[PDB]
Write a protein that binds this ligand. Sequence first.
Ligand SMILES: C[C@H](CCC(=O)NCCC[N+](C)(C)CCCS(=O)(=O)[O-])[C@H]1CC[C@H]2[C@@H]3[C@H](O)C[C@@H]4C[C@H](O)CC[C@]4(C)[C@H]3C[C@H](O)[C@]12C
Ligand SMILES: C[C@H](CCC(=O)NCCC[N+](C)(C)CCCS(=O)(=O)[O-])[C@H]1CC[C@H]2[C@@H]3[C@H](O)C[C@@H]4C[C@H](O)CC[C@]4(C)[C@H]3C[C@H](O)[C@]12C
Ligand SMILES: Nc1ncnc2c1ncn2[C@@H]1O[C@H](CSCC[C@H](N)C(=O)O)[C@@H](O)[C@H]1O
Ligand SMILES: O=C(O)[C@@H]1CS[C@H](C(=O)O)N1
Ligand code: SF4
Ligand SMILES: [Cl-]
Ligand SMILES: [S]
Length: 347
Amino acid sequence: MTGREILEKLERREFTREVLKEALSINDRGFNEALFKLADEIRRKYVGDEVHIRAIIEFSNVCRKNCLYCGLRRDNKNLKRYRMTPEEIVERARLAVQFGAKTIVLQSGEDPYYMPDVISDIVKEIKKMGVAVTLSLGEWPREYYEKWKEAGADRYLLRHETANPVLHRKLRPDTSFENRLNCLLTLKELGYETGAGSMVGLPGQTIDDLVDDLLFLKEHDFDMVGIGPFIPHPDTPLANEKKGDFTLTLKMVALTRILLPDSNIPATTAMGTIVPGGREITLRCGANVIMPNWTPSPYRQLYQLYPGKICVFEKDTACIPCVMKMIELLGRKPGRDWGGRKRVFET
Ligand SMILES: C[C@H](CCC(=O)NCCC[N+](C)(C)CCCS(=O)(=O)[O-])[C@H]1CC[C@H]2[C@@H]3[C@H](O)C[C@@H]4C[C@H](O)CC[C@]4(C)[C@H]3C[C@H](O)[C@]12C
Ligand SMILES: C[C@H](CCC(=O)NCCC[N+](C)(C)CCCS(=O)(=O)[O-])[C@H]1CC[C@H]2[C@@H]3[C@H](O)C[C@@H]4C[C@H](O)CC[C@]4(C)[C@H]3C[C@H](O)[C@]12C
Ligand SMILES: Nc1ncnc2c1ncn2[C@@H]1O[C@H](CSCC[C@H](N)C(=O)O)[C@@H](O)[C@H]1O
Ligand SMILES: O=C(O)[C@@H]1CS[C@H](C(=O)O)N1
Ligand code: SF4
Ligand SMILES: [Cl-]
Ligand SMILES: [S]
């Protein structure tokens, strides 16, 4: 079908593989703009004008895994490794709550040191502050996930990365798509609000792969979906590969919103890294969440999944104020509660 016809099918929610492929393959400006408007309007209708702030503390860059894309991979010897103490992490969380954060995200490499009990202790302390806690710690045994839920954790982010099992295993040689999915299913069973999502523009990833990523997200009806471009890192095997395209990645965000109209979708830091102002554009094309960097110096600059990240030269407390200004200049509002998913049951 033509652009106008694909848009009509999207508006009528005829989400066939062919409609999603054609939406991702058409490069016409008018079509893309209309797709972006559609996603923006669906966002406003379902999740409103509140942009939810998730303050992220990247508390350790130690990792046991060796993912080919990631600057924290275990084989990268050209990176100073760091670990925040549990006291530092709690007090840094308390500062974010003082600054108005209503969710604290704890993210790390897969660092065995904390697992599971030091994380449980931290979570319990942060939960006393009356905020949501989200974990993004990678793949762990069911048992660990269960202990963290009992400790009070509310949400868990585990991007599925790529729904192509062959590409997944090549890029993540310690593990598999099956394992990743099983972790995601376990987290949902345990009562977490669960986040998935993928990178766009991975080496070897095709448009058909991106369609499969959308259908996977739609299948499992995730609470949150984190999408960004692949950004090559010079101390990795994928150093010389092409970066993911911003517009294609933005279309993935827009389609995610159309497919999952009541979901929580961030404007990721990676989007703001590859294009100046990329988060702001993404917030106008389907996204409704922002995750300001709350990692303190001198560690912030050592948490380099990809290079050139924005927010590295700012002061320790700048990023929450910075996103509150962004939200205002976008004519949006800050989140009034924890920003949990508010499901709209349909037919
Ligand atoms: C700001 C620019 C330039 C527009 C422009 O230059 N016009 C503004 C003022 C001109 N006036 C209206 C005052 C009168 C025109 C008389 S004049 O004499 O200037 O031609 C317009 C041009 C194309 C617009 C984007 C696309 O839609 C896609 C998408 C839709 C979403 O939903 C919201 C996000 C997004 C990215 C849009 C944002 C923004 O909105 C853009 C960049
Ligand atoms: C942390 C310190 C010291 C006092 C303190 O420890 N304050 C705890 C407040 C706890 N809460 C945020 C939950 C209050 C909600 C009140 S509210 O009426 O907003 O619901 C206080 C003193 C002045 C406060 C800033 C200014 O105000 C301007 C601005 C208002 C925004 O809005 C949030 C961001 C920002 C930058 C504020 C952040 C933080 O807060 C500051 C630095
Ligand atoms: N080079 C790169 N470009 C863009 N995103 C990257 C990247 N390297 C890693 N990421 C993204 O960063 C996310 C957080 S990684 C930290 C969390 C945890 N270890 C985990 O793997 O889940 C990953 O899910 C991945 O999608
Ligand atoms: O873009 C980034 O740098 C981060 C990586 S994970 C987080 C998300 O939850 O989407 N975004
Ligand atoms: S993506 Fe997560 S698990 Fe993979 S190397 Fe990076 S930090 Fe470790
Ligand atoms: Cl969250
Ligand atoms: S920041």
